[PDB]
Amino acid sequence: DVSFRLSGADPSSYGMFIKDLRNALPHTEKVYNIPLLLPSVSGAGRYLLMHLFNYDGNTITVAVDVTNVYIMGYLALTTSYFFNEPAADLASQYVFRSARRKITLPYSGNYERLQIAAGKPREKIPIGLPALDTAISTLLHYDSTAAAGALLVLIQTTAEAARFKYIEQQIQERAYRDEVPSSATISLENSWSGLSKQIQLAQGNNGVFRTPTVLVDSKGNRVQITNVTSNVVTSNIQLLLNTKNI
Ligand SMILES: *[C@@H]1O[C@H](CO)[C@@H](O[C@@H]2O[C@H](CO)[C@@H](O)[C@H](O)[C@H]2NC(C)=O)[C@H](O)[C@H]1NC(C)=O
Ligand SMILES: OC[C@H]1O[C@H](O[C@H]2[C@H](O)[C@@H](O)[C@@H](O)O[C@@H]2CO)[C@H](O)[C@@H](O)[C@@H]1O
């Protein structure tokens, strides 16, 4: 398991959490020095439990699929909650079985579906450590509309930060003040699967992407990523989605 406590949290402690999260994901291979997530894992070992505590010390446990860093569901007190999707229903066979009741959320874990449930796109939802505190608090008691926004915050401040050093740094900058994600942040989230695939295809193509990936940079300028010498590959991305899952 991995844990993170919002009480006393600072950029350093958050960074240790994201480091713990990355280190909890198994891999047998690195591709261009980036850990390659496994094609699959059988049984309960597929799921990592993240223990998150809000500033008041209240907690939720979030189940994460270690092959793709997808959040499946979470436990709040004696109630478990899962996305309305086959992969999450499968997870519910392994985690939080001792919950007194299980609620299936009225949406899948998809960014488009969550944004629809929340009533707003990611572009408009502030993220940061305070936002994460709020998200944990929101999830403690069922409210599906509020939860959709909370989950948009949670996915970005945990999974996405684990996947991209730039996102981790963006959250550290928001340790004491929330701010909506940069367009670069949204671009990277949207491109993780694409990037993971192209980095793997580069292996037998002399480091060259079979298909360029279009990204928005820090200055808000759209760039083409064509090979593994790009900063996005050498510094930023931290985990690769296995092509067997793409
Ligand atoms: C590999 O990717 C790098 C980008 O990081 C490409 O280099 C850039 O391309 C042009 C000049 O060729 C310039 O606009 C950029 O300033 C370059 N940046 C750097 C860091 O050199 C490079 O062209 C790509 N190589 C291949 C084989 O396509
Ligand atoms: O967990 C956040 C993650 O959600 C998305 O993945 C979904 C996917 O759409 C479903 O097919 C299934 O695998 O469940 C996942 C949700 O748990 C995206 O990958 C992305 O929006 C985001 O990182």
Contact 236, 165 (CB under 8 A): yes
Method: X-ray
CATH number of the domain bearing residue 217: 4.10.470.10
If one counts the domains in the chain, the total is: 2
How far separated are the first and last CA of the chain, in Å rounded? 26
Å from CA of 226 to ligand 1 middle: 8
Q: Which ligand lies nearest to the CA atom of residue 108 in the structure? A: 2
Same structural domain, 67 and 135:
yes
State which H helix or E strand residue 132 sits in. helix 129-139
The domain boundary, picked from 162, 196, 211, lies at 162
Same structural domain, 195 and 120:
no
Residue 184 is encoded by which pair of tokens? 């670069």
Same structural domain, 27 and 119:
yes
Ligand 2 pocket: which of 69, 83, 110 to mutate (most atoms within 8 A of CB): 110
Same structural domain, 142 and 225:
no
Ligand 2 binding pocket, CB closer than 6 Å: 70-72, 83, 85, 87, 108-111, 155, 159
* Alpha carbon distances (Å) from 92 to 43, 73, 84, 209: 11, 8, 11, 37
Question: Residue 27 pairs with which residues in a beta bridge?
Answer: 37
Query: Quick count: other Cβ atoms within 10 Å of Cβ 197?
Result: 20
Query: Quick count: other Cβ atoms within 10 Å of Cβ 121?
Result: 15
42 phi and psi angles, rounded to 5 deg:
-95, 145
Contact 111, 152 (CB under 8 A): yes
Q: Choose among 52, 42, 45: nearest CA to 18.
A: 52
Same structural domain, 147 and 107:
yes
Resolution in A: 1.7
3-class SS at 173?
helix
Å from CA of 225 to ligand 1 middle: 9
**CA angle 26–197–209, rounded 5-degree value:** 135
H, E, C per residue of 29-81 = EEECCEEEECCCCCHHHHEEEEEEECCCCCEEEEEEECCCCEEEEEEECCEEE
Catalytic residue among 112, 123, 160, 168: 160
The domain boundary, picked from 118, 143, 162, lies at 162
Beta strands in the chain (DSSP E): 2-5, 27-31, 34-37, 47-53, 59-65, 70-76, 79-82, 101-104, 208-216, 222-227
Same structural domain, 167 and 157:
no
Same structural domain, 20 and 60:
yes
3-class SS at 185?
helix
168 is catalytic: no
The domain boundary, picked from 127, 143, 162, lies at 162
Same structural domain, 92 and 77:
yes
The ligand 1 atom at the shortest distance from the C-alpha of residue 207 is 27
Same structural domain, 128 and 186:
no
Same structural domain, 186 and 83:
no
Same structural domain, 128 and 206:
no
CATH number of the domain bearing residue 71: 3.40.420.10
Å from CA of 208 to ligand 1 middle: 11
3-class SS at 14?
helix
Å from CA of 8 to ligand 2 middle: 30
3-class SS at 223?
strand
Can you say whether residue 41 is alpha, beta or left, with left for phi > 0 and alpha for psi between -120 and 50 degrees?
Answer: beta
5 phi and psi angles, rounded to 5 deg:
-115, 125
Contact 215, 187 (CB under 8 A): yes
**What gap in Å lies between CA 47 and CA 88, rounded to an integer?**
11
Q: Choose among 24, 80, 26, 74: nearest CA to 51.
A: 74
Task: List the domain range (segments joined by +) for residue 36.
Answer: 1-162
Same structural domain, 69 and 179:
no
